[PDB]
């Protein structure tokens, strides 16, 4: 409901929806080609992309708001994983900004980067191809596992007929406590 000057929302936040859609669909294309969307709920990713747009069209004031604020004005129940999706796409736009000369010299941060979104997405494809040559994989397994699927020891031997008989010498109760096995569960 940000496309209308409803009294419940300040007019500061109203924007043309066309540029909104363009920014959002190119942001989610960026997310898609960077392996973010596969195997995950799309809805939080779309919400995060709408976020990056909404801050990008007017960082002058909108950079100060957070997730709960925007979903309050929009009257939307944001998913819990939305914040994590946001964080990982910030990781991605940092990896994407390191390539550009002006950004890599300016020493930007998580918050300050939002104002250059148009600049990066104007030249997305070549830069993301360069960023691939340093792909994306789940951070959990990107912890540099030195050992991958260690081979377990071979223990298919079964013995001849009975490797032991003492294991059966545990599986039975002597009558001392078998007798009284009927008067606590009653």
Partner 1 sequence: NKETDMFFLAISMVGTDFSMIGQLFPHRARIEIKNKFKREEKTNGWRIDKAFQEKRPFDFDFFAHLLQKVLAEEEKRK
Partner 2 sequence: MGHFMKPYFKDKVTGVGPPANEDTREKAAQGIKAFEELLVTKWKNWEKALLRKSVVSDRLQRLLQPKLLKLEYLHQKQSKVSSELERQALEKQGREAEKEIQDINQLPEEALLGNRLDSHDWEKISNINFEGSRSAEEIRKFWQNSEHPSINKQEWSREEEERLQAIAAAHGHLEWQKIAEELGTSRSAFQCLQKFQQHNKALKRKEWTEEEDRMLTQLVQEMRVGSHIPYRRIVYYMEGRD
CB 50 within 8 A of CB 56: no
101 lies in the site for partner 2, by CB under 8 A: yes
Return the number of the residue (9 or 20) whose C-beta is nearest partner 2: 9
159 lies in the site for partner 1, by CB under 8 A: no
- Residues touching partner 1, count (CB under 8 A): 18
- Binding to partner 2 (CB under 8 A) within 2-61 occurs at 8-10, 59-61
CB 164 within 8 A of CB 66: no
63 lies in the site for partner 2, by CB under 8 A: yes
Contact region with partner 2 (CB under 8 A), list: 21-29, 122-130, 132-140, 147-155: 122-130
119 vs 103: CA distance, rounded Å? 10
DSSP 144: -
Q: Could you identify the residue written with the tokens 């964080």? A: 87
126 lies in the site for partner 2, by CB under 8 A: yes
Sign of the C-alpha dihedral, residues 57, 62, 68, 71?
A: negative
Q: Which residues bind partner 1 (CB under 8 A)?
A: 166-167, 169-178, 180-185
């Amino acid at each position: 409901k940000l496309f209308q000057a409803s009294p419940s929302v300040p007019a500061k936040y109203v924007e043309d929806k066309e540029k909104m859609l363009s920014r959002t669909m190119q942001l989610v294309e960026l997310a898609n080609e960077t392996w973010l969307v596969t195997g995950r709920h799309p809805l939080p990713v779309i919400t995060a992309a709408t976020f990056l747009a909404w801050q990008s069209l007017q960082p002058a004031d909108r950079l100060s708001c957070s997730l709960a604020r925007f979903c309050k004005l929009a009257n939307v129940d944001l998913p819990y994983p939305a914040s994590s999706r946001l964080q990982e796409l910030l990781a991605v736009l940092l990896r994407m900004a390191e390539q550009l000369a002006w950004l890599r010299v300016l020493r930007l941060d998580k918050r300050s980067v939002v104002k250059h979104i148009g600049d990066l997405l104007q030249h997305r494809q070549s830069l993301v191809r360069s960023a691939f040559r340093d792909l994306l994989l789940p951070p959990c397994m990107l912890k540099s596992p030195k050992r991958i699927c260690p081979v377990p020891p071979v223990s298919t031997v079964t013995g001849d007929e009975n490797i032991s008989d003492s294991e059966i010498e545990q599986y039975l109760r002597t009558p001392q406590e078998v007798r009284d096995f009927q008067r606590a569960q009653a």
